[PDB]
């Protein structure tokens, strides 16, 4: 019954909260599993996702060769076909 | 060294549109943070949602997940507002 209470504030909550600000806390409370945090944080809108990856790349570039290597590592783990594409295998 | 500290990144520039189309950044920012090339601020910047319509959807999805955990999710959610959204915490608690 505690959640049915908050329903009246749903639009205010969904309007103010940036979820990535509180999912790390909620995950540590063990009320969000990794499949949960994925659905919340993923970007199915291509326009939005492109922007965010662009910002990520911009941040990594400022770290120089270190960020480049770490970025390639992440692709080999998580986006293997992309990794081969951009590294020419 | 056709990927030295100065030039490695310019090398990827030709693949930028494809990288930005395929990668879901939340799948790799945890890794990159563990590689120590992303600091917590950086990751908040990448993952944040400046578009209201998008942000609303995500919070709604988050609320539905949390509700499925019952009173434990309610208590955790409220604690997270108290810490990170104190004015919203006041609002929903009547204060
Ligand atoms: Zn309850």
Curated annotation (Swiss-Prot), chain B:
Residues annotated as domain CARD: 4-95
Q: Could you say what the effect of mutating residue 35 to A is?
A: Does not affect zinc-binbing
Query: Which tissues is it found in, per the record?
Result: Expression is restricted to several populations of phagocytes, such as macrophages, monocytes, and dendritic cells. Highly expressed in spleen. Also detected in liver, placenta, lung, peripheral blood leukocytes and in brain.
What happens on changing residue 89 to H?
Answer: In IMD103; does not affect formation of the CBM complex but impairs formation of a complex with RASGRF1
What happens when you mutate residue 13 to R? Abolished homooligomerization and formation of BCL10-nucleating filaments
Q: What is known of its domains?
A: The linker region, also named autoinhibitory interface, is required to prevent constitutive activation and maintain CARD9 in an autoinhibitory state. Disruption of this region triggers polymerization and activation, leading to formation of BCL10-nucleating filaments.
Q: How does it assemble?
A: Monomer. Homodimer; homodimerization is mediated by the CARD domain which forms an extensive interaction with the adjacent linker and coiled-coil regions; leads to an autoinhibited state. Homomultimer; polymerizes following activation, forming a nucleating helical template that seeds BCL10-filament formation via a CARD-CARD interaction. Interacts (via CARD domain) with BCL10 (via CARD domain); interaction takes place following CARD9 activation and polymerization, leading to the formation of a filamentous CBM complex assembly.
Q: Quote the protein name from its UniProt record.
A: Caspase recruitment domain-containing protein 9
**Species, as recorded:** Homo sapiens (Human)
State the organism's lineage.
Eukaryota, Metazoa, Chordata, Craniata, Vertebrata
């Amino acid at each position: 019954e505690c959640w049915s209470v908050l329903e009246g504030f749903r639009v205010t909550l969904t309007s103010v909260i940036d979820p990535s600000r509180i999912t790390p806390y909620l995950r540590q409370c063990k009320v969000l599993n990794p499949d949960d945090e994925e659905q919340v944080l993923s970007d199915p809108n291509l326009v939005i996702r492109k922007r965010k990856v662009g910002v990520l790349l911009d941040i990594l570039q400022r770290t120089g060769h270190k960020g480049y290597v770490a970025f390639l590592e992440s692709l080999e783990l998580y986006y293997p076909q992309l990794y081969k594409k951009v590294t020419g295998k």
